[model samples]
Target: DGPYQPTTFTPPTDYWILINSNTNGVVYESTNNSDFWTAVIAVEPHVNPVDRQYNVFGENKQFNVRNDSDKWKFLEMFRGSSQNDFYNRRTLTSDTRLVGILKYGGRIWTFHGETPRATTDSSNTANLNGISITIHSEFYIIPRSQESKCNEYINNG
Candidate 1:
């Protein structure tokens, strides 16, 4: 697709990528071992700066061509992510597979396999009513620390 008529198919949202020093911490060595620097207390979901959508899915409908039968490329985003970070599209023969991701999280695993885009399969039809046809040629990519980690603890005054 050209610039003017670029690949109209849009990725889910957070349509960019991130590669910053904030999320990626670095350790600098100094002659004075105890002499510190001016940085600490940092925890932010730094957005990726790339302009691309990650509209991945696993079978939200029926006869999804990329269902339990077909095979496609998986855009493995991170390693050792939670179940939300990987798709559970596997059985006895197949071990496991991955597809798309959650756009706005501390981590994400988007599916960019099957270029051009994933198609609407039959498995997506009639599974339910008013449902969107979003298959993850891959599945979920959730963070392990994402669950029950928000602090409500109060420190002593």
Candidate 2:
């Protein structure tokens, strides 16, 4: 199936799919990944922190995707340096989600999974995970079981 054999093609959008040439009948790729780009992303654990919140929301509604059971796993939320550590904390919500997204510079930042927080605040009055996160807003991510498979897609690509 071939149509107008245009001399050139332009990607309509980021990660757009377009044919290369009719010679082989097809050719579409995401502007080849740069060596630097791939290298940086591959090694940057910061880019994909494991066992962290990925999406979040407020107020329980029909859109609530979390299972009623274990939904209250995190009675509270905490902000710490690493996913395992926490210093500052706040009450978790049944209406909120733990996984969401951040899109910028053609890259999608994903919140991977949700973590259970202690119902009670930390006993330490001192900082635990360095200068704690200044989350100043209400946000949450969904459970890990519900996280998106972008990791597989990106890594596979």
Candidate 3:
């Protein structure tokens, strides 16, 4: 109370996001335009591209967290330049994912070189330029709903 307005805070992992903590880390709402606010994360990643080795897999189950519909969202993906873009962020599975990760080597082997091609009959190796590894991180945004008084401002993302 006093001269302060509403405030926000970060709950524990098990706790749902509450209407606290503005764009800045401060718990109190912004009296000014909004130079202070907490960083909100809406997405999460399973792997960090920088941390993994360069390798190909015929069937590698890329991990993803589920959403409200219990669907797996592409937390973070790396297929190199196979059939799709790196980190193909999607809510549903796709055929491109299979072609995307179809590589043949780790950090020590050339993805499309003869070393990897001899095994694939060199037919599938045409597009396997390089194995793209994606570094994953969580997505966060300061989501505000009209139903609550705390979530009225834009750029709360």
Each model's lDDT comes to 0.21, 0.22, 0.21
lDDT of each residue in 82-110, candidate 2, tens digit only:
22322213323222222222222334222
**Relative to the unseen true structure, what is the C-alpha lDDT of residue 118 in candidate 1, on a scale of 0 to 100?**
32
Query: Which one is best on lDDT?
Result: 2
> How many clashes show up per model?
31, 20, 26
Q: Which stretches of candidate 3 lie over 4 Å from their true place?
A: 1-67, 75-100, 104-126, 137-157
Relative to the true structure, candidate 2 has a C-alpha RMSD (angstroms) of: 20.3
Candidate 1 stretches with Cα past 4 Å from truth are 1-15, 18-78, 81-103, 118-157
Cα-based lDDT at residue 48, candidate 3: 28
lDDT of 1: 0.21
Worst 10 residues of 1 by lDDT: 148-157
Tens-place lDDT per residue, model 3, 41-143, is: 1222232232322222223333322334221122223332335433422222211111011123211110111111111111122222331222112112222
TM-score of each: 0.16, 0.17, 0.17
